[PDB]
């Protein structure tokens, strides 16, 4: 199943988003998306999107249809059929990204936190869990 | 056990996430998270965490010069003796979160300015796998 959930008020420096699941032994790419709006093709403030079939972890957003310039982690610490633990974390800044007890990735803004309304997750991926503290 | 005390690699600023896993001992009394301002012993703290099994509480305060402030008690304990636990406390910009496990547990409003955090101390009857600031 996909999540999809609905961030009404906005995220502030301090939001943190954690997600566990799985990632199924033929996976190919999932993603997580904070979205500014209900559309899909919404701009994008954050497109977090690791590709197992081609071995990156893909960083970039979306303003009015277009992407911006990706930005690309070291190494990919995911792997199939094998479960994980992801935290994105809101800064004044950026977003960091912890993967398995260690940070990955640090992603300066493109958007303001503020316009952020939706957080989804979606692609070949099983989740146990996700939320937003 | 072993005690946890480390220096701040870029202070406490909102999006500071320090993430505590490990066990409540069989025969634990209590234990503490420390964010203190200060090296030495009685020093300021913007966050005193203080599981109590002995006395069935949480509680959550600030000192300065001694003096501690206005004393705050979460919901119950989600502590077990012989049991493990995980416990997120993320920075805002206006206060600290505490999560235990899977849900948010208590939110304390910043008393002492965020810029005189340099320190992280976890010890008492707590017996720690793993001490992460993120
Ligand atoms: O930037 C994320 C989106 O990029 C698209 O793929 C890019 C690809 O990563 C890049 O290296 C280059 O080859 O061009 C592609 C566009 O054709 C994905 O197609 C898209 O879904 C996002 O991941
Ligand atoms: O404010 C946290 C500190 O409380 C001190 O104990 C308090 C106690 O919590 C309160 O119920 C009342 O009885 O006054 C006590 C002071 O004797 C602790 O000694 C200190 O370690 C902190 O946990």
Not at 9 to 16: H, K, L, N, Q, S
Not at 112 to 132: F, H, K, N, T, Y
């Amino acid at each position: 199943v996909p999540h999809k959930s609905s961030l009404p008020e906005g995220i502030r420096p301090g939001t943190v988003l954690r997600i566990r699941g799985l990632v199924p032994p033929n996976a190919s790419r999932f993603h997580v998306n904070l979205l500014c709006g209900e559309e899909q093709g919404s701009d994008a403030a954050l497109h977090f999107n690791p590709r197992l079939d081609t071995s990156e972890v893909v960083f970039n957003s979306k303003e009015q249809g277009s992407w911006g310039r990706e930005e690309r982690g070291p190494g990919v610490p995911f792997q199939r059929g094998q479960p994980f633990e992801v935290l994105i974390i809101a800064s004044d800044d950026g977003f960091k990204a912890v993967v398995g007890a260690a940070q990955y990735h640090h992603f300066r803004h493109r958007l303001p936190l503020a316009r952020v309304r939706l957080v989804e997750v979606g692609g070949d991926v099983q989740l146990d869990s996700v939320r937003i503290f």
